[PDB]
Amino acid sequence: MELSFGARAELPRIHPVASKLLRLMQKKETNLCLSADVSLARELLQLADALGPSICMLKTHVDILNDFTLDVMKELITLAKCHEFLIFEDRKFADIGNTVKKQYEGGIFKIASWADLVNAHVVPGSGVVKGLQEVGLPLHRGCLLIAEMSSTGSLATGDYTRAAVRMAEEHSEFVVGFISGSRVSMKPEFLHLTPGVQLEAGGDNLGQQYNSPQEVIGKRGSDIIIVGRGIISAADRLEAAEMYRKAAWEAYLSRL
């Protein structure tokens, strides 16, 4: 039968980052990842503080922050420790191994110094994971591979998706799961995170497609919903966050 998050956290071959996430998910009754898609540091830290108790994870796009500094990220880490959530930088590493290693460790962002989780596209081959691993393994980090995408015309389907899964299984010391629209692996130690979620189905003007928490967690078997605009554009952001949390959590309970 379907394992609970608490059970999965204790699997022999589970990743320590994966274990930590699943424990705080069970403990807090949230499988909600906030997509903190804002342009100001103050807004990012405000969201993290106000919605931290409602989320298992906060997803960042630091390259969209007009006033990024490393001190902003240290402050985010303080909030993540206080409220108990993981920080996931949605960087979509997608280059040869030698390049991505530098993009993950260095530059002005120093991503590996603050992100628990990053993600990678599998299009370059497994060298992308090999490069990131050289930096992330010593720092006890995790990685998610992009197996499916939520946008219209996505090419992350069929054999491409299957390749994502194979790559993830061959690098289980570093890769802890997937960005996907559905359960793509049958190994329960892998996490499935799903963007393209709003309470009601719909989309945007630029190819985003939305499905309900019930659809993606209940019917499609994913673990975590990633929600941006459904929360951050709402008149009341905490109310929105709690609505998504309840919807996603009840849909998970329904699978048990």
Next chain:
Amino acid sequence: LYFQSMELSFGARAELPRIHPVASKLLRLMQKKETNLCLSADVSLARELLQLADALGPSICMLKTHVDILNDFTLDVMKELITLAKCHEFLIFEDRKFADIGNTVKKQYEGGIFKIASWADLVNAHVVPGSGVVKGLQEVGLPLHRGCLLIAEMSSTGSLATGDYTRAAVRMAEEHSEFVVGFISGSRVSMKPEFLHLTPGVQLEAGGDNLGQQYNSPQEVIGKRGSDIIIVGRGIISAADRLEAAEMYRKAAWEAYLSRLG
């Protein structure tokens, strides 16, 4: 591969009725300077980037940046780079590999600390998200008269940018030809002469690195496979004499181009 006869020169392609103005500018610079070399300036310090640009600018048609590895990035460094690009006549290509939904990539191109759209002549995108990635970029880039390259093939071992994926890249380019000016690819992927083909994974001798990079010669990628421009990083920037390395790559790539004419 089969190529039709009477191969067009870069100058001739610059005159085609449906050529993109950025492609036309690049093609004329290539013809004028006898270079189809793009330098991949994969350095950590702004000093190094600008010294490369100044010393190697006359040998190159294009400089490819990864500004997210630049430890001391500022917009002032980009202003200095643009002046060198004007003084030595080359385009600036930020190898950002935009690869997210349209709503997100629009902000990544225009915003944040890098403000990429304000300085890069060219950017590139992966086509995995569907055409929304190009539509989002285009909303920022077309008002600014910029161009875009789509990643149709990759140089690395295990690349999934093959077959139907490559074909989808070409179709997406055609659907957005007011903005997309060509491809990152290992070979000619479209017979349409208005499209540029840029090929990374190039060294004077075939080879590779320890993290999945594969190298082919300029003769192989330009002369045999029909690509237009070679993108070279370590082959030049890891050498003791970089100007000599750059000239060697320029000569090899240019002679290979000449070999396909008339």
